[PDB]
Design a protein around this ligand. Structure first.
Ligand SMILES: Nc1ncnc2c1ncn2[C@@H]1O[C@H](COP(=O)(O)OP(=O)(O)OP(=O)(O)O)[C@@H](O)[C@H]1O
Ligand SMILES: Nc1ncnc2c1ncn2[C@@H]1O[C@H](COP(=O)(O)OP(=O)(O)O)[C@@H](O)[C@H]1O
Lengths: 501, 479, 51, 125, 145, 120
């Protein structure tokens, strides 16, 4: 009652036993079902080598066993017959990669699914290459403006930083992702968006959105729908990383969105259970941490000699019922640098984007901030810490001392500041405008609701009538006393005309 | 030599087929002659974990397995992993295999030592429980270390955990004849680079004169397979253990951090397919933790003091990994974001931090009573934190006004100007022995220096420099 | 003033009762979560032992 | 489920008209897969569902979609075992369902019917 | 040490030796106990032995339960402990007192190994972390001891 | 515990004790944080009666006389039902709690109460 012993192989060996001869030229299909196939022969095949079933079904030789090669099927086999002859290929999971990928939608084979046309490429990059080393990197330097006031102030993301987005169902993870991608039209980055196990309709929505926005000129949208095989859902983010590191190594800057990694881990546990590998927590294998660590650490800020290329990984994990200490959450939280934590109780309460400011962290920190941004962000963070302490005193705003009353007032207006509309990203200079108007104390007058309308009118009026501010900050990236005085003037002007309304 | 072929591979778990006579022992490292996509030989290493019989072992890989082929030649080295040790490794980054990754130059040292070893014998220990003196006021008075014991490190980011590490290295180098080592068990590569560069800039690693440095960094990254991330700690351990068994130097063994080594062992056992224990750790959690936590002692020859970071998952102090780690730990220093945000550096909380070494029959009744009175004053300050704000500081009684005054003086005197944070700040580094410490707190708390400004005790070395700064501040205030 | 001192004493006692309650409840919760995870992992490996 | 889906898919393909595809209950499909998995030879995954759960739900949902020719509107009901949305099959359907409504036993028990928990229910529209 | 025999198996010793050591202590004690001599044995701990037995039981693919402890984890402790007796006057009255130690995380007396040991021994001397950290040493909680 | 077996008086007093102990079990969550002061007149009444009841349920045993030091009492049904009838009627409401702790008869409870009022 043993595998690999099919009573026909024993026949072939009884015929040809004389001495044990190399049989790598051939290979037969013993057992095939639910996406895997045990394969005889192939005694010189590598691990990870593409093995090509007759009828055209590519497979990958994952776990080489005693006398049988357990192979995951890169499609739905359902047609390969027992005893059919497999040939090895020799390649190890490569994708052609060129600049002409910019602007298209592909499946995890780097093969287009937008139906436009074939993507001409010359150079190939392996899918499972090793990461940049301990002496081939540079400490994170340059701010990646995400377009969100809250993130760009309190959780500063850098170029070459692996900032995790974590949340529950429908807290806005993909919302913040598209918000960032759409902010990065201006500066010169390549965006990558790798969808794992999502609806083709949702990929269609996001792709059409980038199309009507104009951000398709620099993006490559890898898509792997739910019906696709577990191996393709597993291989998607690595194709994204290979595409992205090709652009990285040519001195250019990249951003990649793994949305999500939970489905990649679920495809991995499916395959590992299917070809009989020992389970761990939630029947995950031991290698899920190895997987995520290799994939994440493939993305970092290269050194000066290698071109100062970089690749921000902005992965997403979805957390179930706030169990952020579960297996895959604690894995991704351990590997990544930062964590942008999204909360549905804030999401329902109106505070959108629903990030959790007390839980969110970024061990890159103010290093990756513009000087103007850090000058305003220090004061902003102190004010928000204060109102976070005083949160349990808002009902008692009738008999608190007027000082803590006014701290409640400032934090109350500052909550109105940080809310943003859907996929409307701001520039760093407009965000500096907003945080300055808030932190200095220019919104105590207007009531709790008007603040949003007041601030948008403020930004537009400044844009139209004091065009020195944005130029100053674009040139120096430093908040200087001249721009401070100019902003005070513009602020009071807009305040007067808005109040006369 | 002993040549065997690969039987089967399942990820980082390989099987090797040896002839009937020759067969390695448990934990014997195995070099596997293997190729690269460019054809280049790439030697992937293992370690025999189980002699599963039928002349075939089950070894766990220490590197990437993709590309390895059934029937490749594996050479039996015949002994546990032997890493390069000695003063050569100072200022040099290493792997779990002891093969350096800084691209400086090859370790020309001939001295190796097996990664696997028994703990020092029972007739070998140095029974004297001594307070390992550091020079930092807070950790000298309130969280006193013991030499050859283990010290947990509880600090969330931004509290200066790395600056504290570099200062500890600097003090053990300058005051004593010590040398430190850093073992990055599961170290994310960007922060590994950050730490290497911060040590290059902070003089802890003399980039111009290697082997005159004070640290031998062992980095086993998260990128590495689960087998490597576990044995990283043993690599760092044996490289430290040479420094005190032969050279009798007071070594510091930083392990950052213990929880990730524990879960890397959990992953190794998971791949090996042994039944799990409770909530998901490996069945040999206690014995695996022992194998690493009992080479850290003070023998007759030297002393390894282990200053290791600890992480509590799901906020459990009762999860098996924290519980087992605390069963070994001797003192914990806890760094808080409060003192970091305010500006009392280092950000150690003298109440959350505790030691079992602060017993009277260990540290002296005078040290004990001064530490107790300091803790009582700081605790009373935390209790009055809300009271004083409402009541007004004047409406307090005289005893509580004295308490808040001396508490502010004490909390400000806890600040210290660091030897390695002078590059950032501009304040020269300082070293404070326990004599200076106990007398400084005796003077501050005994009501004798109760006539000094708050700022005169802030970022100062000892009470003499405190008086000097106080006279400066008073002359600066007169005119 | 007497009534407000009474309410202040009631709060100074009730908030500490809520403290000890949250602490003992978090301890019960830690034990329960540990037992749940262990049971789920053991029931997973029971199926693997069945195959 | 796949039978009724193939019928509706014909209706949308060649008869090129809008379709209403009510499914009840959709959790029982994953239930049957989980019952049949372990006996077929698969190792049990987490709390007891098959390893081929994500791709099973894919092979249903991604087949159910609106195209240029026809539009399949599908109002399908997901059972949730013991009202735990963390249960894998309810957790998996959520990724494929555009507009989701969650019924809460509190609202059902108090007497407020229909018991749609409003703050947990979200749409994409 | 004129009276004492110390049977030591430290942390990084094989779990089989940590499982054997209490029984070595028990045989040593019983030798004197039977020849009209009084004995006092101090196990330290039994929970560490329970962990060592769990390890060497799960290394044998043995069906565990109740926090992964094997079936014979009460049998372990009861075998080890129930050979401590005040002997009869016929056999020489030699008695072996046993004072085993058990550690609890977060004061979990209702844990498997604490309740198992409690159901064997003739009492309990519960020490208290709050009492010991408040300065009342030793911290015997005479309310429940 | 069915009237056809145990008599209607026994059944009725058992149901009333079960009722009052249930109500105290409910109010435990409130009193833990608040205290007995915040309860209604009938709530505080039921809580005081339940304290007296759960202490009167206690009885010293003959075989526990080595640990308690107090001579165990034997008290059957004729005195059990009567004592509980009295406690739930509230005639003994003037007595403290410690009078019902560790006694066999309601008469011994009352005698202990007279001692607790002899010790001023
Ligand atoms: N900052 C925001 N302001 C206003 N509306 C928002 C914001 N973010 C998200 N939304 C709304 O919330 C809905 C859910 O957003 P989104 O799909 O990004 O969440 P998600 O985390 O991707 O959901 P899932 O976890 O199911 O993929 C969207 O329809 C969007 O309209
Ligand atoms: N001992 C110290 N003295 C002065 N500044 C410090 C000290 N420790 C930390 N800092 C401040 O914190 C920063 C370094 O913190 P670091 O040790 O990197 O913590 P983490 O790695 O957790 O972020 C420096 O910019 C420094 O200004």
């Amino acid at each position: 009652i043993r595998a690999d012993e099919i009573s026909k192989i024993i026949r072939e060996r009884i015929e040809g036993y004389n001495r044990e001869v190399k049989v790598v030229n051939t290979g037969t299909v013993l057992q095939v079902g639910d996406g895997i196939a045990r394969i005889h022969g192939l005694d010189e095949v590598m691990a990870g080598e593409l093995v090509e079933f007759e009828e055209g079904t590519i497979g990958i030789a994952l776990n080489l066993e005693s006398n049988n090669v357990g192979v995951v099927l890169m499609g739905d086999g359902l047609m390969i017959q027992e005893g059919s002859s497999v040939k090895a290929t020799g390649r190890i999971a490569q994708i052609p990669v060129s600049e002409a990928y910019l602007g298209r939608v592909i499946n995890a084979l780097a093969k287009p699914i937008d139906g436009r046309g074939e993507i001409t490429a010359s150079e190939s990059r392996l899918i499972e290459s090793p990461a940049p080393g301990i002496m081939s990197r540079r400490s994170v330097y340059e701010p990646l403006q995400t377009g969100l006031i809250a993130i760009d102030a309190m959780i500063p993301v850098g170029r070459g930083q692996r900032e995790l987005i974590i949340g529950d169902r429908q807290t806005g993870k993909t919302a913040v992702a598209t918000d960032t991608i759409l902010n990065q039209q201006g500066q010169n980055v390549i965006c990558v968006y790798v969808a794992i196990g999502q609806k083709a309709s949702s990929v269609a929505q996001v792709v059409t959105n980038f199309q009507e926005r104009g951000a398709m000129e620099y993006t490559i949208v890898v898509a792997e729908t739910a019906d696709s095989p577990a191996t393709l859902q597993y291989l998607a983010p690595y194709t994204g990383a290979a595409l992205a590191e090709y652009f990285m190594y040519r001195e250019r800057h990249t951003l990649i969105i793994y949305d999500d990694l939970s489905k990649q881990a679920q495809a991995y546990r499916q395959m590992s259970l299917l070809l009989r590998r020992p389970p761990g927590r939630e029947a995950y294998p031991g290698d899920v941490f190895y997987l995520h660590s290799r994939l994440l650490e493939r993305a970092a800020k290269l050194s000066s000699l290698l071109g100062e290329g970089s690749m921000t990984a902005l992965p997403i994990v979805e957390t179930q019922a706030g169990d952020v200490s579960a297996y895959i959450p604690t894995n991704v939280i351990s590997i990544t640098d930062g964590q942008i934590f999204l909360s549905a109780d804030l999401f329902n309460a109106g505070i959108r984007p629903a990030i959790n400011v007390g839980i969110s962290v970024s061990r890159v920190g103010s290093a990756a901030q513009i000087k103007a941004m850090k000058k305003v962000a220090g004061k902003l963070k102190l004010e928000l810490a204060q109102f976070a302490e005083l949160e349990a005193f808002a009902q008692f705003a009738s008999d608190l001392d007027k000082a803590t009353q006014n701290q409640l007032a400032r934090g109350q207006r500052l909550r109105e500041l940080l809310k943003q509309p859907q996929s409307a990203p701001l520039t760093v200079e407009e965000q500096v405008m907003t945080i300055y108007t808030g932190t200095n104390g220019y919104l105590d007058s207007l009531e709790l609701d008007q603040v949003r309308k007041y601030l948008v009118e403020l930004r537009t009026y400044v844009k139209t009538n004091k065009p020195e501010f944005q130029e100053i900050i674009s040139s120096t990236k430093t908040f200087t006393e001249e721009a401070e005085a100019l902003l005070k003037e513009a602020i009071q002007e807009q305040m007067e005309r808005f109040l006369l309304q | 030599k002993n040549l065997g072929r690969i039987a089967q591979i399942i990820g980082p778990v390989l099987d090797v087929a040896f002839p009937p006579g020759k067969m390695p022992n448990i934990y014997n490292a195995l070099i596997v002659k293997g190729r690269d996509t460019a054809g280049q030989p790439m030697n992937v290493t293992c370690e025999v974990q189980q002699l599963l019989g039928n002349n075939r072992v089950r070894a766990v890989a220490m590197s990437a397995t993709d590309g390895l082929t059934r029937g490749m030649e594996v050479i039996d080295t015949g002994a546990p992993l032997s890493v390069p040790v000695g003063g050569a490794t100072l200022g040099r980054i290493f792997n779990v295999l002891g093969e350096p990754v800084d691209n400086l130059g090859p370790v020309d040292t001939r001295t190796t030592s097996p990664i696997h070893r028994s703990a020092p014998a029972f007739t070998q220990l140095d029974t004297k429980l001594s307070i390992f003196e550091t020079g930092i006021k807070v950790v000298d008075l309130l969280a006193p270390y013991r030499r050859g014991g283990k010290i947990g490190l509880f600090g969330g980011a931004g509290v200066g955990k790395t600056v504290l590490i570099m200062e500890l290295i600097n003090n053990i180098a300058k005051a004593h004849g010590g040398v430190s080592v850093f073992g990055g068990v599961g170290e994310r590569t960007r922060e590994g680079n950050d730490l290497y560069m911060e040590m290059k800039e902070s003089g802890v690693i003399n980039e111009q004169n290697i082997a005159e440095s004070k640290v031998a960094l062992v980095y086993g990254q998260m990128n590495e397979p689960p087998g490597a991330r576990m044995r990283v700690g043993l690599t760092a351990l044996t490289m430290a253990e040479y420094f005190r068994d032969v050279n009798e130097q007071d070594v510091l063994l930083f392990i950052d951090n213990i929880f990730r080594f524990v879960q890397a062992g959990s992953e190794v056992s998971a791949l090996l397919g042994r039944m799990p224990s409770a909530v998901g750790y490996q069945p040999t959690l206690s014995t695996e933790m022992g194998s690493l936590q009992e080479r850290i002692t003070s023998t007759k020859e030297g002393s390894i003091t282990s200053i290791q970071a600890v992480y509590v998952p799901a906020d459990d102090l009762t999860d098996p990994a924290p519980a087992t780690t605390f069963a070994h730990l001797d003192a914990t220093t806890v760094l808080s974001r409060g003192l970091a945000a305010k500006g009392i550096y280092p950000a150690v909380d003298p109440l959350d931090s505790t030691s079992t070494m602060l017993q009277p029959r260990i540290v002296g009744e005078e040290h004990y009573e001064i530490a107790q009175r300091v803790k009582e004053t700081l605790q009373r300050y935390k209790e009055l934190q809300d009271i004083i704000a409402i009541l007004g500081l004047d409406e307090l009684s005289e005893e509580d006004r004295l308490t808040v005054a001396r508490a502010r003086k004490i909390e400000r005197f806890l600040s210290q100007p660091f030897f390695v944070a002078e590059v950032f700040t501009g304040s020269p580094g300082k070293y404070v022995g326990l004599a200076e410490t106990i007398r400084g707190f005796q003077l501050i708390l005994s009501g004798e220096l109760d006539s000094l400004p708050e700022q005169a005790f802030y970022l100062v070395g000892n009470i003499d420099e405190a008086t000097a700064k106080a006279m400066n501040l008073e002359m600066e205030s007169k005119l | 003033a007497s009534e407000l001192a009474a309410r202040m004493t009631a709060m100074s006692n009730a908030t500490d009762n809520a403290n000890e309650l949250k602490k003992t409840l978090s301890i019960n919760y830690n034990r329960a979560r540990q037992a749940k995870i262990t049971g789920e992992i053991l029931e997973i490996v029971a199926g693997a032992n069945a195959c």
